[PDB]
Design a protein around this ligand. Structure first.
Ligand SMILES: CN1CCCN(C)C(=O)COc2cc(ccc2OCC(=O)NC2CCCC2)Nc2ncnc3[nH]cc(c23)C1
Length: 351
């Protein structure tokens, strides 16, 4: 058996193949621009289930996965008992140029689940539990001088994504409801410690905070903004900022959240976004008309009036504060009355 790569550097993988004289491939899980995710049995560890992330054999991806491995090591040192809901590695190796990182086997990521539910949103109790877990996991990294920088639904995975199929009460359709809402945070390859180099731009655009857009520098509050975005997405089933471009995104922020504080406008070197101290944009352009038609004040997106919905929206708005210094921290978020709704099993992490 020659090892074969396709034209983009992906490993050609077959069921039955072994790697490191140990990992037997038994299924497919995923593929992205990074490589593939395959399900293996680990024959050195009693045929335990493994998700093996196999990185393209392309220098820059190999360099990034090396950075990811080094981060994952540091994270494990700080959480040896694996209590803080992070997806840590059990092993790593260079398989003929392909970096491979072995992880626990999980269910569907939270985007894929929403998508296979035809974008019907998670119910509030699931959203609440998921919020709590995310605040917990990330508070732990924040207190250990780490920022994730790339939180998004697809990097958050259910431990088990099995679901009940129910008839939607108020629509003429079926709905998939996850049976257990325990989640884990993955993909630490861009995670950055306080003392390490901070690139000008971080985050996937839809989850990217205004301080990064305005090139004001960033730290842990970046993750809080992303969390606010993710929670909106879970609750409504569509993205908060369905945007492709900076000026448009800022306009959306203004329409949904209110004016950008003038102290941030005064400090940014990105003055091309502003004119007479206000955002400058073409209301008659395609993006202009799109934003004017579609972006409404945040509170308008509430599905019900009841206390738990109001509390969710209070918390999201605090996570979506423009000023990163004023934005809610996750330690504070975990004291929010929204979380009074959690069952004792959810609150004590016995799910
Ligand atoms: C390695 N893994 C982070 C990888 C990087 N990352 C965050 C993603 O890629 C997100 O999207 C997926 C991740 C997994 C599987 C499928 C995904 O997408 C669907 C897709 O590709 N469909 C493909 C379409 C064609 C067929 C499959 N990941 C996991 N799945 C199961 N257990 C796991 N343990 C740890 C991980 C993991 C973390």
């Amino acid at each position: 058996r020659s090892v074969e790569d396709d034209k983009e550097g992906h490993l050609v993988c077959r069921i039955g193949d072994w790697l490191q004289e140990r990992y037997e491939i038994v299924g497919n899980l995923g593929e992205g621009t990074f490589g593939k995710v395959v399900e293996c049995l680990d024959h050195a560890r009693g045929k335990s289930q493994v998700a093996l992330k196999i990185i393209r054999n392309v220098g820059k991806y190999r360099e990034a996965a090396r950075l990811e491995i080094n981060v994952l090591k540091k994270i494990k040192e700080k959480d040896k008992e694996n209590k803080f809901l992070c997806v840590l590695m059990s092993d790593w190796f260079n398989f003929h140029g392909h970096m491979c990182i072995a992880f626990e086997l999980l269910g569907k990521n939270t985007f894929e689940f929403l998508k296979e539910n035809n974008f019907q949103p998670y119910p509030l109790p699931h959203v609440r539990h998921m919020a709590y877990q995310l605040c917990h996991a990330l508070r732990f990294l924040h207190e250990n001088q780490l920022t994730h920088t790339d939180l998004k639904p697809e990097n958050i995975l259910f431990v088990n994504s099995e679901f009940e199929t129910l008839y939607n009460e108020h629509k003429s359709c079926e709905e998939k409801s996850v049976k257990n809402t325990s989640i884990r945070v993955a993909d630490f390859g861009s995670a950055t410690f306080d003392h390490e180099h901070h690139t000008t731009i971080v985050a996937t655009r839809h989850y990217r905070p205004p301080e990064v857009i305005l090139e004001l520098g960033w730290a842990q509050p970046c993750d809080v903004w992303s969390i606010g975005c993710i929670l909106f997405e879970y609750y409504r089933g569509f993205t908060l900022f369905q945007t492709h471009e900076n000026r448009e995104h800022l306009v959306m922020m203004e329409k949904i959240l209110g004016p950008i504080p003038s102290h941030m406008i005064h400090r940014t070197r990105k003055q091309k976004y502003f004119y007479k101290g206000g955002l400058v944009w073409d209301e008659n352009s395609s993006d202009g008309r799109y934003v004017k038609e579609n972006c409404k004040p945040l509170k308008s997106y509430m599905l019900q009036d009841s206390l738990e919905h109001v509390q969710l929206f209070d918390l999201m708005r605090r996570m979506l504060e423009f000023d990163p210094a004023q934005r809610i921290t996750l330690a504070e978020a975990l004291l929010h009355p929204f979380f009074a709704g959690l069952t004792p099993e959810e609150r004590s992490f016995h799910t």
